[PDB]
């Protein structure tokens, strides 16, 4: 995806709960450095539901596209109160961002 478009939906619909850069802080939600090739509730010092915890899923592109469409369908139980990317090319080029800033 486009990387450039996805940093600017990351901003818009995620960034007021999450950070993506080494060291990141929690906000809402878990910083989300070295999320992909992770399974699901792995960032460390965040207190994540039982539900994100016990997934058990590999973060990576198929699993990301899915639950970014909708997140509690794929976690019920979360307390990532999001509704979700609708449009598959915008969720492509979040994912896209996501795998660049996060690594
Ligand atoms: C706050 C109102 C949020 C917004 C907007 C977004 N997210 Fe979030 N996210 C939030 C919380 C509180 C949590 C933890 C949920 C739990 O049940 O513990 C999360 C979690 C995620 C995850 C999973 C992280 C992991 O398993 O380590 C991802 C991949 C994630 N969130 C992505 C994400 C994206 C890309 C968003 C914008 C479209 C987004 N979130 C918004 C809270 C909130």
Redesign the pocket.
Known sequence: GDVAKGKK??VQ??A???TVENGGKH????N?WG?FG??????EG????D???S?GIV?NNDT?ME??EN?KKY?P??????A??KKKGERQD?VAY?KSATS
């Not at 965040?46 to 539901?49: D, L």
């Not at 139980?77 to 999001?82: A, D, P, V, Y």
């Open positions: 939906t990351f619909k995620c007021q709960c999450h906000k809402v939600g878990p989300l999320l992770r399974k699901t509730g792995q960032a965040y207190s994540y539901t539900a994100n915890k997934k973060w990301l639950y970014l997140p976690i139980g979360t307390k990532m109160i999001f979700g990317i979040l996501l």
